[PDB]
Symmetry: C3
Subunit: 336 residues, 3 copies
């Protein structure tokens, strides 16, 4: 497309929402290609990541870890306004794995505190894709400070299975998984700091062990439980988008399955089916589609169970509806 | 199916066998859906995991690590009687990744010492699948104490390749891979504990390093070697089912291949072909089909070679038959330059 | 084939080229099956792997880490003369993952210093495959000392996508990724040793932590950056073969994609498409095909970004040509 052709396309402004929710969108594209406009303000802020009051100096797109999910369709343009307020201390940028050129956009979006930038790219490939900050020389530090999220580029005709039949979800959730590397003092207590730069040297030492202290969904142990448990009903079709910008993960829905899983996150690669546990490499997003068949509590985990249940990588679903005794029944309940 | 319809189905009681062997079964289903009945007794037991005498307080379905492979066909029902004898100290349960609902069955099978339970589920999806114990609040500790195994849900028409051609194995082995996290004393020697509970806190510390001390097949370093090496012959078609309930692995047959590999373990997902090294994520089972073409000794390993050869993740195959010089020949044996 | 038929096949000697470059070959096979002859001399030598003078006693096929890429076609034979000079002090051998029998060749090629051997095997399966030294009882030590490379067994009709359309590359590079485990003294300084064996016990202790001290491409931090960046042009089709003989990796082209990725490395397994980050398990090779669409500097990394930017696993591509503003444009450059 020429500059004039792009200038003539319709514009649509989207209001982002906090994960694990996803902003309003249509699965099947409404009309032809558009320039879809998003704005995010970067917030450097302390977050508390566990019940011991452990702190991270987060670097947070739109104020959350992960950053919010942006949804467009294939061959739309994504036009992001990125703002780094004067209240921040560091330069930031953005690299979209969905984009082509200039280090995913990072080379064109380096903004110091008090600056903003607008980047446009053509979403040429359908899938879920990571985005993350990547300042030269400080790349992993920003990413493991929570400065990452994902986008979804839907096919213009929505999702399909490997044989071209439509797959239409009722609900979508975005689970961003984060590895954190929190320094500890000689007595094993997590250290606190009063500026992001103060934590840098100590954090790099932990990073270099390749052993996270915490592995969490939505920025904290237990974040996607209780008041923030995900919900569904028996019969409901749910898409779970999952990202990890730095480290491998292996998602699993305890009591469920991934009926269709785009484990590589790319919709032109046919989905795996009937999955127990799928695998998403560090630096990628994946997506799983499931139709709930039983009510009750589910856990959704990284199935390194030490990572899930010692380090924090566990969420819950609460599912309403009627129990199916054909699928499962207790013939003899626990008894003497 | 209604309660009355399920009640009318034939029942078949199966006797489990110890890994790496698999109980007798038919690849293609015989007749219509059945309720296939299994029983396992849980044993908390001390096991030795290396030649030095290192001990683990194992938590073992049917007394083995891994637990035994249960085999059914798609749309059969698996009906497990699970018994937690009064000689044990902990509550246990079972989560079948093959099942749908109640945390895989774990929510319906919590049994204290002196209790039993019977769970039935419909095996709706074909593949190999992990099962493991999962007591709320103590999940990884039970799993990395060996309390895991796998099942195989065969398609009713047996296995096929990605293009509808039948794949019929001559024999099947189940390799359960276990990551252990054994505490060490200040000399760097592995610790022993009088009771299983005594090891908990020290073990959790090792677990949090995400670095196992041992990575083993069939419960111990060298367990599938020597007189316990797996066997095959030139021309023989072997299915190797491999599980890892907690941690990633990357199986490889040294001197062979995975001709067809269901790396995700799910038979409706077409297999990869001609594989050198495949990948099974923690929390899953996979399966590889190979026709042997050369005789001799093979090693079957996790191809993180440190894990294989330092930490224990190596098994052997002994293979009979005639050497094939077309496939490989020593043109010049090691000799002076 | 009969004995006389095998004996009648043409024999052809090929001169090897150091990674990341690849020796002369045709994508579509020229003529019928051949016995393709290669020679490699093993070199034990101290190499410096980082900017701080850190040494490894490398064990190097053909003198390089990784060893060179050998290229044949399916149903050719690969006939390797492997030489272990008398100046070396260890026994070595070779295991081809592409080969069938005798532990991939390792059982037939155990050569002490002052010995040579010639192994022939039929390349029955198309793909990229690891090769590595594997002396019984010291396998990981040789491999993580750099004694590994890869081969490519092309289909006789060249590469194809999943729909049977030809994929013809303009150039090919081989990126061998190496995990090193360098001992440190109690002050955290890397240790040096007189002879390879002197380092054995200390190195195995580091290996058993499963935490490399360095993760590098082409044998050193920065070996494929700066003036040793790989090159391409807009419009050029590039195949990037990547291997890791011991440990998982997750390659990613920053600013690009894997348009077609044989993530398992095997050409009869259909390639994934539109990949952001692909996954190659330890003990395997993979290959990615990409058509460059934007000029500039790209980084090519293991997308555990700590591994990439703290431990060494980052390469560059320098790409010439015209910028494409349709694909990406800075609507508003960074500004107040
Ligand atoms: Cu990235
Ligand atoms: Cu599980
Ligand atoms: Cu190998
Ligand atoms: Cu940043
Ligand atoms: Cu248990
Ligand atoms: Cu060697």
């Amino acid at each position: 497309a020429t500059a004039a052709e792009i200038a003539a396309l319709p514009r649509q402004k989207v209001e982002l929402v906090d994960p694990p929710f996803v902003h309003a969108h249509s699965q099947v594209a409404e009309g032809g290609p558009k320039v879809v406009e998003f704005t995010m303000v970067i917030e450097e802020k302390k977050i508390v990541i566990d019940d011991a009051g452990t702190e991270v100096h987060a670097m947070a797109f739109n104020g959350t870890v992960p950053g919010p999910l942006m949804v467009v369709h294939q061959d739309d343009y994504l036009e992001l306004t990125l703002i780094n307020p004067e209240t921040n201390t560091l330069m930031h940028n953005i690299d979209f794995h969905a984009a082509t050129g200039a280090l995913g956009g990072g080379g064109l979006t380096e903004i110091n505190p008090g600056e903003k930038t607008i980047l446009r790219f053509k979403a040429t490939k359908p899938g879920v894709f990571v985005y993350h900050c990547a300042p030269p020389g400080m790349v992993p530090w920003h990413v493991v400070s929570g400065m990452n999220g994902a986008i979804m580029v839907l096919p213009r005709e929505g999702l399909h299975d490997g044989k071209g039949k439509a797959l239409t979800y009722d609900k979508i959730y975005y689970v961003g998984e984060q590895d954190f590397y929190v320094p500890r003092d000689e007595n094993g207590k997590y250290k606190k700091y009063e500026a992001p730069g103060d934590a840098y040297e100590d954090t790099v030492k932990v990073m270099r062990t390749l052993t996270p202290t915490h592995v969490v969904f939505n920025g904290a142990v237990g974040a996607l439980t209780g008041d923030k448990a995900m919900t569904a009903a028996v019969g409901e079709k749910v898409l779970i988008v999952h990202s990890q910008a730095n480290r491998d993960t292996r998602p699993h829905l305890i009591g469920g399955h991934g009926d269709y899983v785009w484990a590589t996150g790319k919709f032109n690669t046919p989905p795996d089916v009937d999955q127990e546990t799928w695998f998403i490499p560090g630096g990628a997003a994946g997506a799983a589609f499931y139709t709930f068949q039983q009510p009750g509590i589910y856990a959704y985990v990284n199935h390194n169970l030490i990572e899930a249940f010692e380090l924090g990588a566990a969420a819950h679903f609460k599912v309403t509806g009627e129990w199916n005794d054909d699928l499962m029944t207790s013939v003899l309940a626990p008894s003497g």
